[PDB]
Amino acid sequence: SPGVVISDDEPGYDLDLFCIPNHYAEDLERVFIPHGLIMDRTERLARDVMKEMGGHHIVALCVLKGGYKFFADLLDYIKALNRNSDRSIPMTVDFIRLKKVIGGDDLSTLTGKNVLIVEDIIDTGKTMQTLLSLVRQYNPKMVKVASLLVKRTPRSVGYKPDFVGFEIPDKFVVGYALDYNEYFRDLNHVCVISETGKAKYKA
Amino acid sequence: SPGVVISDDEPGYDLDLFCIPNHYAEDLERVFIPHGLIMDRTERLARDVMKEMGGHHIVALCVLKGGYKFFADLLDYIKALNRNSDRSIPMTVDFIRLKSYDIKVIGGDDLSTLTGKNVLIVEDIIDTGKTMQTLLSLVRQYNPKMVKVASLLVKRTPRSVGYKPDFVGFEIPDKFVVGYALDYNEYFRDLNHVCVISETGKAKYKA
Amino acid sequence: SPGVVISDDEPGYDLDLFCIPNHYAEDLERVFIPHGLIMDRTERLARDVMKEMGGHHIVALCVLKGGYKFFADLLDYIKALNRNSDRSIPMTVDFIRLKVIGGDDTLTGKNVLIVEDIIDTGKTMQTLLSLVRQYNPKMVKVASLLVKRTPRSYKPDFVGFEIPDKFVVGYALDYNEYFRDLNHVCVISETGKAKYKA
Amino acid sequence: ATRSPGVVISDDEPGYDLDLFCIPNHYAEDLERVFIPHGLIMDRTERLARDVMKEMGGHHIVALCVLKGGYKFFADLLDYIKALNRNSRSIPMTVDFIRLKLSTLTGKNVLIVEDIIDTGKTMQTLLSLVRQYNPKMVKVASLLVKRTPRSVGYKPDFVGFEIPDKFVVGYALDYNEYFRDLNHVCVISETGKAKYK
Ligand SMILES: O=c1[nH]cnc2c1ncn2CCN(CCO/C=C/P(=O)(O)O)CCP(=O)(O)O
Ligand SMILES: O=c1[nH]cnc2c1ncn2CCN(CCO/C=C/P(=O)(O)O)CCP(=O)(O)O
Ligand SMILES: O=c1[nH]cnc2c1ncn2CCN(CCO/C=C/P(=O)(O)O)CCP(=O)(O)O
Ligand SMILES: O=c1[nH]cnc2c1ncn2CCN(CCO/C=C/P(=O)(O)O)CCP(=O)(O)O
Ligand SMILES: [Mg+2]
Ligand SMILES: [Mg+2]
Ligand SMILES: [Mg+2]
Ligand SMILES: [Mg+2]
Numbered sequence A: 001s002p003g004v005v006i007s008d009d010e011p012g013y014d015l016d017l018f019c020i021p022n023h024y025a026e027d028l029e030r031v032f033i034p035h036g037l038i039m040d041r042t043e044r045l046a047r048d049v050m051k052e053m054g055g056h057h058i059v060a061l062c063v064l065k066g067g068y069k070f071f072a073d074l075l076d077y078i079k080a081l082n083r084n085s086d087r088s089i090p091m092t093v094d095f096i097r098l099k100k101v102i103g104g105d106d107l108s109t110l111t112g113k114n115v116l117i118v119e120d121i122i123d124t125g126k127t128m129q130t131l132l133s134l135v136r137q138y139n140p141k142m143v144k145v146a147s148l149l150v151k152r153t154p155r156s157v158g159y160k161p162d163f164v165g166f167e168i169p170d171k172f173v174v175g176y177a178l179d180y181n182e183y184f185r186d187l188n189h190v191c192v193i194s195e196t197g198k199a200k201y202k203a
Numbered sequence B: 001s002p003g004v005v006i007s008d009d010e011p012g013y014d015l016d017l018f019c020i021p022n023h024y025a026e027d028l029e030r031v032f033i034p035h036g037l038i039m040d041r042t043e044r045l046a047r048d049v050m051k052e053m054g055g056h057h058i059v060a061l062c063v064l065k066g067g068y069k070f071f072a073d074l075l076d077y078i079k080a081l082n083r084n085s086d087r088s089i090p091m092t093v094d095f096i097r098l099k100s101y102d103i104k105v106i107g108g109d110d111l112s113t114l115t116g117k118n119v120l121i122v123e124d125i126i127d128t129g130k131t132m133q134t135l136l137s138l139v140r141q142y143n144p145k146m147v148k149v150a151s152l153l154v155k156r157t158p159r160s161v162g163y164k165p166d167f168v169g170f171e172i173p174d175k176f177v178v179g180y181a182l183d184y185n186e187y188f189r190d191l192n193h194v195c196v197i198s199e200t201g202k203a204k205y206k207a
Numbered sequence C: 001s002p003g004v005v006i007s008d009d010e011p012g013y014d015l016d017l018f019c020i021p022n023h024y025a026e027d028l029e030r031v032f033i034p035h036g037l038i039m040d041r042t043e044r045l046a047r048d049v050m051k052e053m054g055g056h057h058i059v060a061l062c063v064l065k066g067g068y069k070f071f072a073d074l075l076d077y078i079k080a081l082n083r084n085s086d087r088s089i090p091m092t093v094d095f096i097r098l099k100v101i102g103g104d105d106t107l108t109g110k111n112v113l114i115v116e117d118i119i120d121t122g123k124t125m126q127t128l129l130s131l132v133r134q135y136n137p138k139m140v141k142v143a144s145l146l147v148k149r150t151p152r153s154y155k156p157d158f159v160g161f162e163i164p165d166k167f168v169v170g171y172a173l174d175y176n177e178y179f180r181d182l183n184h185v186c187v188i189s190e191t192g193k194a195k196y197k198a
Numbered sequence D: 001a002t003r004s005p006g007v008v009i010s011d012d013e014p015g016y017d018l019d020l021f022c023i024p025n026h027y028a029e030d031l032e033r034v035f036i037p038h039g040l041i042m043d044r045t046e047r048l049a050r051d052v053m054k055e056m057g058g059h060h061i062v063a064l065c066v067l068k069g070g071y072k073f074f075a076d077l078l079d080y081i082k083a084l085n086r087n088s089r090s091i092p093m094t095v096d097f098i099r100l101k102l103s104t105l106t107g108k109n110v111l112i113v114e115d116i117i118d119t120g121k122t123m124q125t126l127l128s129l130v131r132q133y134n135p136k137m138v139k140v141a142s143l144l145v146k147r148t149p150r151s152v153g154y155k156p157d158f159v160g161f162e163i164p165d166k167f168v169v170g171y172a173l174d175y176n177e178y179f180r181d182l183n184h185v186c187v188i189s190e191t192g193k194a195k196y197k
């Protein structure tokens, strides 16, 4: 699927209807995707991943930093599947940051393996284009990408992930490990940042 | 606060986007309020409840059967607040059911247990408001210190007698919904999301 | 299966290592079964129930008041299996209390799961079992979070934990209506017994 | 003093029969016993989060995750801290990750989050680097601390569980990269040890 489509005229939710940390009370305009909705969608993505990749060992590759929450949660739902079903296949994990690929195991660990790349957001698609090209230099057996969010944008190079949580307008969103200048990662919901927030936290 | 307002024209979500019990697959039309959204809203309600009612022993009254899930979850969020704050208050629980013949209270403790306590009535849905006005009239006779009502859902309807609860999860259109313990002829309680039921479904489970 | 066997000499855990409501700080002696451990065991019980009772339609019967938490959580784990795995319920629910308030009068030809907080003398369970059986169900099974090792003049089909003959409270189990608002199962202290004595 | 000493697990702790829990099929033969149930980890971590906030909540916290084994404890501990921050009076928090085989820290309350302390060498090594970014304060939370005469004597500030000298896996802790995808902390069978060395 293209995922849960959040349309351009999505009002999202007033902050006052949810529990929000006091230190961000002025810096957010609206809740855009409630944490629990992310959980529900992620539960279903875990099933789609297993239906598609469950027949072999998987190396799940977390794209730090923004990917960390989605990754942990997605893997927790896969694990729940694995321990309540007859069949299960093991998973190993690894972590990388992009700048060139930094950190992470020798990517020869991906050689001949089924790789699941887990990302927070695809925008132009350039980052994923680049990572896919890098990973493929190490001859994995299979590579699929899961991204919590995919933006509708004219800048898209035309790359589309295999698993997508939500398809969103081109608004700047933060929360659930997504940041604005390292802030807002410590927020459970995805939210649209306000202009006041953009100015307080700009570098 | 009328709660999270769901508009008349809200399409809900395609079932294929979520994990749905197989046995209800063609009995539902859309997911209307995802479970997780109910959880997030309930977390805020627990905080609102403690702000108003946390000053004295609370008796939380579950209106069975449809109230049971919202009750368990709301109380769990309240317990989480109470074991992570400096000071806390005891909470006791009871369960009642209202039976239609005219409407009367079935079960529960002797209601003298309510005397002098902060009573929180927890309901799945307010529609006409007649059930709650009835329950409130009974409860008040036992002189609680205060009595407040939390309802997961409140329906916008012309048939409303004008009762509004103190705490509201979601304000919804005049559509028939099921899930999260709300039923259609006892079915659909075993579903985590609030959903709208299909034509195939209403027919299948019809009395 | 007798469930998770908690030995007679089990010391439990210091309260100060867990999150506990301050209003019960002096009323508990030890944490006995941490909430999270109840969840882990309950997850496995849900799978055992579905292995044995699914799929025909199940009516899950909640024995109030103490069974309410175990019932809600066990049913949540069963629902998780119903939407993620290769098998299904449907389930309907009812709630009974012994004081027999509620009940719908429904059980005939159905698979009935009685859900109980604790078996001690076994008397509530015998009563629930002669009830239900009068409506000729297709099958009856009993799930009990706790079973005490104590003399008992039916063995439950699904057991969370087999515990010593100690008075425990928490996870909806009460002492004179108190301690239901505690997520862990804990052993009540002497000062707790005196404070909330009726 | 240890700000939050841990659940002491005795040398003769027998753990739990695997058959009493939900275990991934692919590890059914490779594990011997459940040692620390996932849910027990969660309950301890909840109290740990409160202890952290009591000690460090007066100023911006930077939580530093020590990959790979620390990732689960880190995600969960931070989730509990976040819950405290939104149901209260709150303090901003930022995250970073480091792996052993950062101006984000300067002037802030740094919480290093680790899976296990054994000899203490790794933590002493890491501390000696982190201090060079001149934090306001540095604290270490470790899910597990092993009782070993081999301990160089280093003690973290927040401890989940103090365990005997046994090899454990699960909750992101690995044996040669295996067993990370397991929610419980477990002791590894003889067959799993030989199979994955
Ligand atoms: O709405 C947004 N919120 C937060 N970040 C956003 C957003 N849109 C684009 N970005 C940047 C996302 N990424 C930024 C890449 O760098 C991320 C490093 P980290 O913050 O450690 O996860 C680019 C995606 P593409 O190559 O497809 O254009
Ligand atoms: O959309 C709906 N879904 C499920 N049930 C609905 C709905 N609308 C009204 N109801 C009936 C709710 N109640 C029905 C009362 O009976 C209790 C239902 P149960 O929890 O299954 O024992 C009426 C409230 P009021 O007096 O304000 O009109
Ligand atoms: O250690 C204990 N803690 C709390 N309650 C205990 C305990 N032992 C027996 N009981 C009484 C349990 N009751 C439990 C059944 O119903 C629960 C009544 P309530 O939860 O207070 O509305 C009877 C057990 P049985 O009929 O097998 O003898
Ligand atoms: O029981 C165990 N299970 C898993 N690993 C264990 C265990 N005991 C020591 N270790 C090695 C842990 N660490 C190993 C560090 O490197 C491995 C980090 P990762 O990438 O998470 O696998 C040594 C700590 P210290 O300097 O205090 O001796
Ligand atoms: Mg990214
Ligand atoms: Mg960024
Ligand atoms: Mg109702
Ligand atoms: Mg009804």
Ligand SMILES: [Mg+2]
Pocket (backbone or CB within 6 Å): C063, C064, C066, C067, C116, C117, C118, C124
């Ligand atoms: Mg009972």
Ligand SMILES: [Mg+2]
Pocket (backbone or CB within 6 Å): C174, C175, C176, C177
């Ligand atoms: Mg009792």
Ligand SMILES: [Mg+2]
Pocket (backbone or CB within 6 Å): D066, D067, D069, D070, D114, D115, D116
């Ligand atoms: Mg480590």
Ligand SMILES: [Mg+2]
Pocket (backbone or CB within 6 Å): D069, D174, D175, D176, D177
């Ligand atoms: Mg290792």
